[PDB]
Design a protein around this nucleic acid. Sequence first.
RNA 1: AAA
Length: 461
Amino acid sequence: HQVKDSLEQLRCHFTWELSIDDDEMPDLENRVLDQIEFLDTKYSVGIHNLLAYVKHLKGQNEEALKSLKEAENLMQEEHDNQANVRSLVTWGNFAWMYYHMGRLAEAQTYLDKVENICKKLSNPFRYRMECPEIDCEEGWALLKCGGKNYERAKACFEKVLEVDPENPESSAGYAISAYRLDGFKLATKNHKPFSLLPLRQAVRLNPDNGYIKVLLALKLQDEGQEAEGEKYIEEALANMSSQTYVFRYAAKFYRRKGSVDKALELLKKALQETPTSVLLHHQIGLCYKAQMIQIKEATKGQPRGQNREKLDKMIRSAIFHFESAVEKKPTFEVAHLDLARMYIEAGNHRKAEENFQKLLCMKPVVEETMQDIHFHYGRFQEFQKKSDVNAIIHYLKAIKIEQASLTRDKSINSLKKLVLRKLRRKALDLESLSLLGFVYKLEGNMNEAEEYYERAERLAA
RNA sequence: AAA
Ligand SMILES: [Ca+2]
Ligand SMILES: [Ca+2]
C-alpha cells in the first residue's frame, strides 16, 4: 500500500478535493479552454493540469496525459528551460494518472522525481512540497472550480501573504477570491468591502494586469466611487491582454453606469472570442432587460408600432441569452431566476412557473439566493396567478431564511401589503389578523403585534 | 455571473 499512501502525500489536483459537480463539468471544461486561449498569465502549467484532471474525470485518461505533456512542454519553451517547482504539480498528476491507468512502474518514477526535488530543496516532507508557488497553484485550482471552493482558495493565498505580504501572485489570488466572496454577500445587510484594499494592493503589485483593474473598478462602483473606478476601466481597455475578460467586466461596469449600448458592444466583441461563456450570455440578457425597461419608461408602459417591435426584440433576445446560459450551466441559479422573470414579461406564465419550480429544488452555494427565489415566486403567485394562498406561502419561506437582506425586507413588506389588502375586504379574517401581527412583530412593534394576535385569538369563538 |  506504499504507492497509494505516497500518492496521497502529493500536492496536486487529485489531492485538492476540488468540488466539481458532474452537471458543472461541461462549463468548467469550456472555461478552462477559454483560459488557455485568452487569459494572459505568466505561467500556464496550472491550467493545463486542470484540463488534464477534467479529462480524467470524463473517462479520457489518454487525453489527460496529453495535457500533462503539454504542461511540461510549455514549462520549458516559454521560460528558457529553467527548472520550476510548479512542475511538481504536473509530476504529481502524472503519478496519479499512471496509477489509475495501471502503469505502476511509471507512477513510481514520478513519485521518485518528486521525492528527489523535495530533498534537494530541504523540504521537510518527502512528497508534499511546501513552497508559496504550490500554495498559489492550489488556490488557482480552487478558484476555477466553483464558488463552493472559494473560502479554501482565499486561505491558500492568505497563507502566502502571511509570510510575504508583497507577493504579487498571491496578492492577486487573495483579492479575486475576496472579491467573489464579497459578491456572495452583496445584498446582505451591513455588508462590507473586504476586497477593496486587497484589490488596490493587487493592482499596485501587478501593474500590467487588466483583469484585476476591472474588478477594482467594479468594487469602487459598488462603494459609490464610480468615477474613480472608470479610470481603472480605461487603463484596462488600453492593454491588449486578456480581452474577453477585461471586456466582460467592463461591460458590467458600463451597464450598471447606464451606458447599456457601450456594454453591449463590448459583450458582443467578447462573445466572438468565447461564445460558450455563461457570464457573457447572462450579461447580454441583462443588457436587453435594461433596454426593455428603458422602452417601457419612455412609453409609460404602452409601446406601440416600432416601439412595441423593439420591446419584443428585447424580451425575446433576453430569453434567448438566459436560456443559452442555463443550457450551458444548469446550476446557474440566478440566470434561471432572470429567465423566469423574463417569461413573465413575455406573457408565458407556464414557462415562468416551470423555471420557478426548478429553482425551488436547487441548493445554491449562496443560501440567501433562495430568499429571492421565494420572493419572486410569491410575487408571480400574487400578481400573475392571483393566488394569495401561494403568495403568502412563499413570502413566508423567504422570511424564514433569517439572514437580513434587501429581499427579506421586501418580502416582509409584500406580505404586509397583501394582508392589509385582504383585511380591507374582510376585516375579521382571522388568518390575516395573525399574519399582520406576525409582520408587526418582525418589525418590532410588539404592542401592535400582540393586539392583532389577541384580536385574532378573540375571534376564534 | 441577478440583486
Ligand atoms: Ca493573449
Ligand atoms: Ca493543446
